[PDB]
Symmetry: C2
Subunit: 908 residues, 2 copies
Amino acid sequence: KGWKFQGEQGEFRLEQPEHNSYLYFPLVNEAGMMSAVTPNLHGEITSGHNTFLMEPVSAESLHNSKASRNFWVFIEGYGAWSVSGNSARQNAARFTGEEERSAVEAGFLWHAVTRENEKAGLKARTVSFVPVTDDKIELMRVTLTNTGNAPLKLTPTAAIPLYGRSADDLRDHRHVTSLLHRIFTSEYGIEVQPALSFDERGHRVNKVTYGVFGAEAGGTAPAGFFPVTEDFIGEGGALDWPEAVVANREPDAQAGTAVEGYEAVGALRFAPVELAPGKSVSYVVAMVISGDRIDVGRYAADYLAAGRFDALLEQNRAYWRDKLDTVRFSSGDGEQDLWMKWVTLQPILRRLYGNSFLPYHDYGRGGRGWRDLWQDCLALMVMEPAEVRHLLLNNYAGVRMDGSNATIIGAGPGEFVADRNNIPRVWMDHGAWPLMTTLLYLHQSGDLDLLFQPQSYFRDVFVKRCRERDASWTPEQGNKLLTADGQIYEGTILEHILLQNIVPFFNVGEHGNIKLEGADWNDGLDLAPERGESVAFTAFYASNLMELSELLLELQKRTGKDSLDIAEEMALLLDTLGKPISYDSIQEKRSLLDRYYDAVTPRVSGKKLLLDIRKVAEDLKRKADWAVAHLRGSEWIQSKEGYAWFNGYYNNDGERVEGDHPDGVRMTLTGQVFAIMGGVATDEQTEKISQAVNRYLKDERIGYRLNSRFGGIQQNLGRAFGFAFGHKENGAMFSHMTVMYANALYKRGFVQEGFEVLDSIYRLSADFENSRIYPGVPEYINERGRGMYTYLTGSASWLLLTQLTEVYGVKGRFGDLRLEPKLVQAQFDGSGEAAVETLFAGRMLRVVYRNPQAAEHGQYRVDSVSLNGQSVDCQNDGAGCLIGRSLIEALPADGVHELIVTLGRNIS
Amino acid sequence: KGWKFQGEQGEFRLEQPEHNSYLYFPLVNEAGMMSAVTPNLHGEITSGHNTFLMEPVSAESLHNSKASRNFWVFIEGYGAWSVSGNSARQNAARFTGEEERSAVEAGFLWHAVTRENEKAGLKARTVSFVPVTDDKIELMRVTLTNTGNAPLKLTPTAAIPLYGRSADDLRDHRHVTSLLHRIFTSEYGIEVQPALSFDERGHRVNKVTYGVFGAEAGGTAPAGFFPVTEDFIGEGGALDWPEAVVANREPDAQAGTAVEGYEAVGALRFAPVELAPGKSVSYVVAMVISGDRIDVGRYAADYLAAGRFDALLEQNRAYWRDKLDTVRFSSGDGEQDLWMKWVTLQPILRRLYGNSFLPYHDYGRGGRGWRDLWQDCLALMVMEPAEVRHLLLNNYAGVRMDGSNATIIGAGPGEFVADRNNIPRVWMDHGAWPLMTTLLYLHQSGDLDLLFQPQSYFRDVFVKRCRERDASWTPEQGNKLLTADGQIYEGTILEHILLQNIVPFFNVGEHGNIKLEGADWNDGLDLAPERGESVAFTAFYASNLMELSELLLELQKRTGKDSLDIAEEMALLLDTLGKPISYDSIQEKRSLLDRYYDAVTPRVSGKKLLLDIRKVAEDLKRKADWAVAHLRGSEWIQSKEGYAWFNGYYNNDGERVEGDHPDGVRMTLTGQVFAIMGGVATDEQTEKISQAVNRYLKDERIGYRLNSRFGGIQQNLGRAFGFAFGHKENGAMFSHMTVMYANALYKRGFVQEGFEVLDSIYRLSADFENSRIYPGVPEYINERGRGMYTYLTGSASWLLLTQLTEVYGVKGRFGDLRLEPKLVQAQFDGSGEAAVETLFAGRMLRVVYRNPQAAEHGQYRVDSVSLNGQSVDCQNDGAGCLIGRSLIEALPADGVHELIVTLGR
Ligand SMILES: O=P(O)(O)O[C@H]1O[C@H](CO)[C@@H](O)[C@H](O)[C@H]1O
Ligand SMILES: O=P(O)(O)O[C@H]1O[C@H](CO)[C@@H](O)[C@H](O)[C@H]1O
Ligand SMILES: [Cl-]
Ligand SMILES: [Cl-]
Ligand SMILES: [Cl-]
Ligand SMILES: [Cl-]
């Protein structure tokens, strides 16, 4: 069987875990230690691309490399034995039905491997976690227990294989760079500090030190060390059967030894020990990365002294419990509520790993992309709202004056990097996500004033959305847009938003939809920059323009403001205010955009125009209406079989991608999602889209595919079609897009369809027989039902947000709290209750929905709402109940405040 | 217990070979299949940086990765068993004293792993080689033998783990790129053809196909396949304990199956077989790389049909025997004579591997560097002369009009590439080696006319020896030096040579020796381009100038010609012909060089001057004499203990590198070698140098170190000092430099000292207990006595050349054959003979030296010489006996012609 949850805090257990390929669990802290641990203690440990403590790995390494973390016991009358089962002898029992009993347990945020040797009568339990302290450190505790009837004599040896340099050195100059190693032994362990680093940064002095240290439970140091890998393993040996352990050799080194020029292993030999029947002995090992030589005394006192491991583990458990208790779901699906706690962890992991340094994520180098700056705000708005305002303001510094944006993110707040040499890529969807995220912030917080903050615009060598290079640019002008007088231009946050959505409107292909450029959301649609079109994201931009129009009008009626400060050159793009052009003409839209580019390159005038907020809203509505009409009139398609949906793409030959085709209908999920979400699709078109999706995309084994099968490579569209069908962006169940589809369905009132979609993701993810993953939502479910690219996927943010804001219906409306449950009957528990604890206006609320009548969605309404005891007026704007912000703000800061919403049946 | 030679052809055997870490053996062909094989059949298989059939590896992989080539037998009553010992079960016996008996045998050019299972009564023998056909293919034959008293029932499964893409994908996008895999099964095996390649070339369509195919001895196809790696190994399995084999599962796939998106393994399941007591069964596996889908029928007919393996192996043995029989040594040291046969193989390997794609050589990408263009000619002149003239002419196309040279070598003959990635590096020694190699060609061949062939000069954005960028440069100027009128300038080969040696003469540092620039021979001396000086290579350039002077004079007296065609601008550099400058002035030498650079940048005039050959020789001699005087007067140094030698370097602070120092004397071998070789060092200075070398550099465990210990990193000198002492260019016994030291000693008559040096390299290399290498000379012997960077080192070329041309003394003199033995008494065999078979003027000669008087070197002379029977005039008393080229050319083409040289007191 799969894993089974234990207790009510999200802890789980998996029996015989190493009977599954490619499993791994994450251990990480804010300080920057990033680890992965497999059932046999393989994985990796790193603090960045250039500073790997253990060897860099991909998926195949987890079986093929012998260099796991290990801890050995030489058992008298038996021999060498690995506490995680990673020895030649133990591995040779796999598939013979003579395997030792074993298990993984894990929680927030820690991991435990158990193993039993019935022959010798020994049990081992090895706990890994990364402390929540300001050090880059991983700790290991091995506890050995004599489960037999007589004394055992054991000789323990810890062994953490070291790498201690850049992943650039994996093979390229791998051996040469081993010659730069300097190993220093001391009382508690082994430090490795290369003299130099050779990697893509060049040849440089290194001070970075990688440390492996250990002690018995009582604080007693190791008896000695085998710091040199080839000496530890022996001539013709290996890390899963090393001579030093197998032949029980005396230590090569004591404290104060230096050794130069060899690959290193943190091999710590402990004193031999006699273990009474029933009694235990424990060992603590620490793996440390530091910017210089390590104060080994301080680390020994903080991590290896008696009871430090146990105390730090409690500290770790409490810190993570505190992070995750910001969102708690409670329903008739107890297994799913606890599964969602792991989903709730994932957005934090993506931040702390920088979408990198786990075995599948083998290409990542730790940075953040443009999308992450926005996506990371979604989890934060729900879990840690305080930080979000600062992050959004800074993010808008990266926008260029042509609507595009910096694609390389820097160290500082609002720091972005120019790449003046590389042939650079524009993703056409990059302008769409900021508004969506910002709108969410406005509705949760009520902070409408954010839209009128000043901010600069990014500027580098690339202009006209990276079509041309600029001649008159030097390093002396700096990375910000200048005025005629040479000053840094600043526009409203709103001016930035306008620009990001208006520019794409005019940037149309030969079929009238917005150009694909380098790709949209789908990174694999990278081969149609000349003639490609993302109809899919045209519906997103159309919807954004309409929301912008509604937003401006609502700013007038709430703020009172009549005016918008916008740069004079942007007035060209708001042509409804001057001499309107025909939006039916492609030539005219292109020409007007070329005029705009010329007006703002290399500099702007600096002069701003002050425009009527209602007249600007009218321009935005006109554009939106045009796009809505064109999409419905020109990109609504039907197969001969009678299904109908929206074409999502035109390829680099100007050909429509979707519809009937030799070898089968071509359809994409991406082409439907934003049409539905934003209102381009009518209700009738949404019913039809769902049927076409269910017909062409919904697989009975793997769920809602990102696209149907296109035969072979598609070199006029994208490299994604080089992937085998059902993998990555070619037809896998790609969680992010699928969650957004569900989100869109819920938004539009298609609740049963939306539920089916969300429930599919959970069922696939948790069907361990096929998925072979721990709790969490993967990036994708593949052709064989396996969970791929675990933990770091952005889909988790959306899953969390969709459950909170759509399914349980707890969301903001200009800072006021709206309650609009879209829960189905089957989600209510044995007392007809389903609840969510969440943060809103700086207070923890337990929103409990009571459905005593057991009504299905559509058959229920809100009958009453009581807040912490007393009654509440729900001044109901539309289909749900609306509570004013002040009533929540008036609550006590401490404690969880209960808000009981009673549901009853409809009339008539 | 090391390896032991067997027979007289250089075949060897090693018992319990996998009791040694990091061992590997090379298998390679001209077609481009490049392989390495370890005692457990690990290593790698590739046709280039971007086309790896098996996973790319470094040293640590050879133990740490489970993905060796493998062949499994599921033995009834026993279970899974690897014919090479690479299974979890078999590995778990290591260090328990329950290991199975095993062995490697190898020869030219093939490899054999044997193993015995005493429990089951089964012996396996697995032979690997690369055929000498026009395909990129490696073959494996596994022969299983029942050594027990009752029948065995066996189920065989071959398993070659596939990678099938660029080494760029090793980790970076490793998994993503697995999704591009397309696996096709057919009757005889498995093809992998990725739909696309993602690597440093970009995202592209791929057609390259990687194939694993197999058959029984009779040509019977496999019963089926497990083409998908994760299915073959099983959930929680591994390539050294795969479920498909361990649980004896039925095949996943038959012929005609396609599978997309997974890592692949060439896992071929053969029919179960009952093996009688005493009898054998064999299997042939073929690993193929092709530019498109493979014609599997043709490969099956050519490689898998009955008796094809055995026939192709004979063909391989004969081809290599024929390549290596061009040089054969025979002496009182039989083990060394056979060891040298392996040394003789190495230059061919360096060419065919492009100094890459063996486990230690983990940074190489298959290309050639500037030095290789010259070094590769040394082995060729002795083993395959025909190609050499063309290679030299083409090589000179790479020289720039400032004496520097292109550093990136291209596809075509004489094609050189301009560096698109900024970052230009000049190695100051690059101008020195061409003359040394060319002179050797002139003396072996007699083809003095080569020096007057026309050739272009390379041109790119970088000028003044890559100090400045050129303003008036576009793609529009092209890759060749233009004249004022816009034509491609062509100069004599000799004009190129002059320029390469004269420019460095003026390119001096603040201490008056030639600037280090980006590094010299030592690639690790890369941190003193501003103020560094290579005194070491100043002695080389000084010697080159003198040889050039002697050469020009000898051209007059042999060709008859009195003139040299040289570009007018080069006359500035031959200042003795116009207004001489003072060579004692650094400022004046620098200024004259800056004038020259200005005269030739961006273009030359095209007009040539015709200069007196004797007056040019006079200019060259003047320079040489100046450099010889300055080095002896200013760079001869002494420690307080009283040892004396030549300072080799100034560092980037303008400080002298060598001499007394806190924590110990600093001395380099490189600073001595060319001083000795070229005559800068007098005989007395050479005696003293050898004593200082022996005192400071000669380690009793590891031999002649490249340098003594400098404490810690040396950031004003080179990155080499970041290496642990005794590794790579920081104080290891670095074979190339050590061989050249020996060469220099022999050249100067220090024969006992030279012998000690050459014998040290052999003894260290062959002391397997410490060296842990197969026969051959390594790049270096390290601090623990281990042989490192095997096979591909350029030291082998020099070792071969030094044994032939100095030790046995068989060398050219303007095409005439000179015999000048420098053999010591102990090298003569039991009949007082030592001999060498070698190619000269297109004929195989067996030069046999007879020393009946048992005289030591220095006490013997040449008393008579007979050629195939009749007597020979030796037109020369002094140093050696000199035989005219015609007498050799008059011999029959076929056959080995004996030339008996009798030595007396
Ligand atoms: O892993 P994730 O976040 O689910 O999704 C990943 O692939 C998507 C499709 O190419 C991109 O839009 C995301 O930026 C990327 O992180
Ligand atoms: O491996 P090899 O050829 O013995 O020697 C290697 O290192 C030397 C010292 O840096 C260089 O001069 C050679 O060009 C290089 O190939
Ligand atoms: Cl056992
Ligand atoms: Cl990155
Ligand atoms: Cl056994
Ligand atoms: Cl290369």
